[PDB]
């Protein structure tokens, strides 16, 4: 034999309090019957932590779980049910077996979310006096709790926009408030960045109407 | 409550072995089996096999049996897997789970005990401050060091409100680079003092920056 779990769909978005559906369907029956117990489980995992238990035996909710999470189905249809979905329930959710060996997961669904268009608040860092001794100068560039993930930074030193010395990292989507976060890293020698003044960021995100820049002199 | 308290990283060459432990802090074995799930990167959850603590019962699904073995002592409540013959493909996130004994599995989980195989050196981070200059965002950037992952905390921990560590990029060295930030109001900046800590156990570094405006 071998159970196969399959998960439908792959990736969910809904506004907050829409209802949230996810099925799984097992390859054979996961129903022991003399006890009439289904042998299914559901999952909630985040980014950088451990899977979290939710719904087991099918239908049973986990202590400390909310009334919102419900489970569902018998053989070898089951489903997920979040009704007021929250910011929170942005995560991926697993279905797993237990009626056999080799135990078996899904393919995990990711849960997303929709919020009002959210400008960045801009910060700018220049290098620190003690990163300089060693001949280096990092410059960083923040864009603080901003929706939607896309956007757009440029460099610009002494007015010269920047290319191929820069990298940026994104933040995945906030528990509390849905909105995202991003670093830029300028990164030049200490001669490079002795030779200069002004040292400029400029943002491009639909929430802000005209493209914020924060600037700074060295010294 | 329970816990299942698992290191937080090893790092080996290709062919070298590891030693994934779990230590079962809890709660108490036995009667408890446990259970070894692995994540790859971005990828799902993938079953590796079974234990009976009671007196070490195991399986293994056919693709782990042969390179893996699951050992266990119920003296120190600690269970293991040792993975052999080190591959590139086998660096992931090892998972101790807890099996309970009716609705199969995994109440209480573990932290993860990422995986490296690589054959290049240890390396200690450079931490700095990014300093502020009616919200104030200041931070630390945590620059050059190998391998994944340093630990930020703000505080020593009691500052968690707005804090944003972010993933970690490989640099054109080969080393990784994070910074890590928190948004504060403007007014505690005079009264309030901030001091990173930043942990990388595999080269056993400790720093504690304080971030001054």
């Known amino acids: 034999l071998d159970i196969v779990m399959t998960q439908t769909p792959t990736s969910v978005t809904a506004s907050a309090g829409d209802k949230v559906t996810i099925n799984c369907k097992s390859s054979?029956?996961?129903?022991?019957?003399?006890?009439?117990?289904?042998?299914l489980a559901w999952y909630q995992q985040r980014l950088g932590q451990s899977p979290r238990l939710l719904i087991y035996?099918?239908?049973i909710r986990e202590s400390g779980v909310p009334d919102r999470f419900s489970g569902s189905g018998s053989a070898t249809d089951f489903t997920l049910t979040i009704s007021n979905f929250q910011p929170e329930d942005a995560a991926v959710y697993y279905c797993?077996?237990?009626?056999?060996?080799?135990?078996?997961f899904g393919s995990g669904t990711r849960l997303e979310i929709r919020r009002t268009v959210a400008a960045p608040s801009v910060f700018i860092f220049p290098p620190s006096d003690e990163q300089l001794k060693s001949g280096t100068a990092s410059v960083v560039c923040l864009l603080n709790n901003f929706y939607p993930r896309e956007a757009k930074v440029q460099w610009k030193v002494d007015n010269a926009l920047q290319s191929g010395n820069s990298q940026e990292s994104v933040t995945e989507q906030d528990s509390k408030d849905s909105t995202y976060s991003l670093s830029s890293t300028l990164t030049l020698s200490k001669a490079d960045y002795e030779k200069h003044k002004v040292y400029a960021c400029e943002v491009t995100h639909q929430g802000l109407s005209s493209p914020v820049t924060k600037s700074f002199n060295r010294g | 409550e329970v816990q299942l308290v698992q290191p937080g990283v090893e790092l080996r060459n290709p062919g070298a072995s590891v030693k994934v432990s779990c230590k079962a802090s809890?709660?108490?074995?036995?009667?408890?089996?446990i259970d070894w799930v692995r994540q790859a990167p971005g990828q799902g959850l993938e079953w590796m096999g079974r234990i009976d603590p009671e007196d070490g019962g195991t399986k293994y699904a056919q693709k782990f049996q042969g390179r893996v073995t699951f050992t266990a002592d119920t003296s120190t409540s600690t269970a293991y897997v040792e993975l052999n013959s080190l591959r590139s493909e086998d660096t992931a996130v090892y998972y101790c789970?807890?099996?309970?004994?009716?609705?199969?599995?995994?109440?209480?989980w573990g932290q993860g005990t990422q995986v490296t195989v690589s054959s290049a050196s240890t390396k200690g981070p450079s931490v700095f401050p990014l300093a502020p200059s009616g919200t104030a965002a200041l931070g630390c950037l945590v620059k050059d060091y190998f391998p994944e992952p340093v630990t930020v905390s703000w505080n020593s921990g009691a500052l968690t409100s707005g804090v944003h560590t972010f993933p970690a990029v490989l640099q054109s060295s080969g080393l990784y680079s994070l910074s890590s930030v928190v948004t504060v109001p403007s007014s505690s900046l005079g009264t309030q003092t901030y001091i990173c800590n930043v942990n990388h156990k595999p080269s056993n570094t400790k720093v504690d920056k304080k971030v001054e405006p």
């Open positions: 797993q077996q237990g009626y056999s060996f080799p135990y078996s």
């Open positions: 054979q029956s996961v129903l022991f019957s003399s006890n009439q117990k289904n042998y």
């Open positions: 789970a807890r099996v309970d004994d009716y609705y199969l599995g995994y109440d209480y």
């Open positions: 035996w099918a239908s």
């Open positions: 809890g709660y108490i074995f036995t009667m408890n089996s």
